[PDB]
């Protein structure tokens, strides 16, 4: 199966500019697109954490020490019983408390790109700016919950890489380097290829619910990581991503066809249903508290 | 465990024993239905204890209840889950299952249709549109599925993938603990109640009623990992489902009460399979 042919965008003076002809219209219909990584970003702190977080703090250099030992942190480390993936998931405060400052710096840059995509999309959908803070639970302006994930795919386990899921928030900005990610398009798993120098952007369940009654609804793509098999001298698969989410204590909104925001359900119960159908393991507070 | 409504049969009417009645059952998305006293459940329990066994060794009487792991059309060995199951529509049951089992399935399917018509009536949906929005399932058409599930305890996995049933109405037989439902975000066990089927609704009922005054939800459920052996036998279950045909469209009652086709059934089912099972049986419940 051939990979998806997605739109490609770049940021130019804080505006989203599309290099491919379909533009933001086609990208929203696809539910995902590639976003050029701003040339000044150093990705190496994120890759370093993805290569080290699951290793013991000792033995090893004192320089790598703040990048290791995270399997001990019950607050932000998640060993998945049924999948190859183990991952850090940390909100803003948790990143500043537990992750190296160069990683925190990288997350802040990725978060700004996620917010840029969010405001571009809301504008593209003709949603009144006056309701942006309310319908995003504050996420649009850097509030809400700004999640970070660092994933390591453990090849020694004969399991699927990542549970099939829809992301739960508004916008995801994802870094990948290896094959393995797939999306459900028309009922068939289509690979999403890594594009060097680009993030992958998609939308989450909160954007799907928000726009489900509009003229051009935006979908949250259903995606998984297939079982990862080691290729000699190729490193284990990893990924890292930031997500702009509504806070778990609030409500999810949906635009009525008359253009009015309606609070339709609580975020926390939505996330709990998500955890139950996606992971179904002991980490029942994952992404909530 | 949940405190569900209980109903029993009475001349082709659904009669509720408990005070919440049909209204509360539709709110819960599930309830217990008394098994008609004349029904023999043993053909179903027998198939559930035999279908995964080799044709031989064993008695010639049990042979038609065995050897289904070689039937590529109706047998599904799950990679990531303890469950292995038969899934057969009407014709396949006719063609591959013992008549005693086909007869029990017909009796369960009739109950599923009784529930479906009681639910469409209780929601005030016009009877003139029943055949259109159910793809013929309300009157015994569409696709009437049967599942026979065996939970392999030697597999150290979840018992059953968490899922919402895909159709309109499910009638399920269980005898052992293990089944759980997601209520208010928490996994709550659904206990086996002797002499009762479990009834719930599927994605098609949820989508159909999502924008009415009293939407009916399709309960999210799973089967925990089944602990290996000691004395008790392996867990099993069997059930029938009234589904829209894969070739049709899923409908939804509008704000004004008129049916609108919102998406195709097959693409709905393929998405379901991809997120629920995510294995090679990509035509499960479609072909
Ligand atoms: C694969 C995993 C690491 C991330 C995955 N994607 C999501 O968007 C959410 C995160 C943001 C938590 C909030 O729900 N949940 C998930 O499971
Ligand atoms: C657990 C399995 C045996 C049955 C389970 N429940 C459903 O309703 C459907 C069936 C009816 C097939 C059509 O989708 N799919 C499922 O996976
Ligand atoms: O690792 C991947 O490619 C997918 C990661 C992902 O889906 C997520 O973090 O939510
Ligand atoms: O085995 C059970 O208890 C549930 C089975 C089920 O959910 C199904 O067949 O759809
Ligand atoms: Cl239900
Ligand atoms: Fe994801
Ligand atoms: Fe089910």
Residue numbers in the entry:
A (entry chain B): 3 to 291
B (entry chain D): 5 to 291
How is this structure described in the published paper?
Here we report the mechanism of three Fe(II)/α-ketoglutarate-dependent dioxygenases in bicyclomycin synthesis, which depicts the natural tactic to sequentially hydroxylate specific C−H bonds of similar substrates (cyclodipeptides). Three αKGDs (BcmE/BcmC/BcmG) catalyze site- and stereo-selective hydroxylation of inert C−H bonds in BCM’s (bicyclomycin) cyclic dipeptide scaffold, one of the simplest peptide derivatives without additional functional groups. Our hypothesis posits distinct regulatory mechanisms: BcmE employs steric hindrance, BcmC relies on inherent reactivity, while BcmG utilizes a directing group to control C–H hydroxylation. Although these three enzymes share only 35–42% amino acid identities, the overall structures are similar, and r.m.s.d. values are 0.70 Å (SsBcmE vs SsBcmC), 1.07 Å (SsBcmE vs PaBcmG) and 0.87 Å (SsBcmC vs PaBcmG), respectively.
The DKP ring of substrate 2 is locked in the hydrophobic cavity formed by F245, F276 and F288. Two carbonyl groups of the DKP ring are involved in the formation of direct hydrogen bonds with the imino group of W281 and the water-mediated hydrogen bonds with the amide group of N277, respectively. Steric interaction between W149 and Ile moiety of 2 causes the 7-OH of 2 to move upward, forming a hydrogen bond with T170 at a distance of 2.7 Å. Notably, the distance between C-3’ and the iron center (5.0 Å) seems closer than that of C-2’ (5.7 Å), which contradicts the hydroxylation selectivity of BcmC. We speculated that the crystal structure only captured one state of 2, and the single C-1’ − C-2’ bond of 2 is rotatable which could rotate to the state that C-2’ directs to the iron center, facilitating the hydroxylation reaction. This is in agreement with the results of DFT and MD calculations. However, the single-site mutations of F245A, F276A and F288A have almost no effect on the activity and selectivity, probably because the cavity of the SoBcmC is too large to affect the substrate binding and orientation (volume of SoBcmC is 252 Å3, but that of SsBcmE and PaBcmG are 139 Å3 and 210 Å3, respectively). The W149A mutation dramatically reduces the activity, owing to W149 may lock the substrate in the active pocket. In addition, mutagenesis of T170, N277 and W281, which constituted the hydrogen bond network with substrate 2, resulted in the reduction of C-2’ hydroxylation activity (19%–75% conversion yields) but performed the C-5 hydroxylation activity (4%–23% conversion yields) to generate product 2a, which is also the inherently more reactive site with the lowest activation free energy. Consequently, these findings suggest that the site selectivity of BcmC-catalyzed hydroxylation mainly depends on the innate selectivity of substrate 2, in which one C − H bond is inherently more reactive than the other bonds.
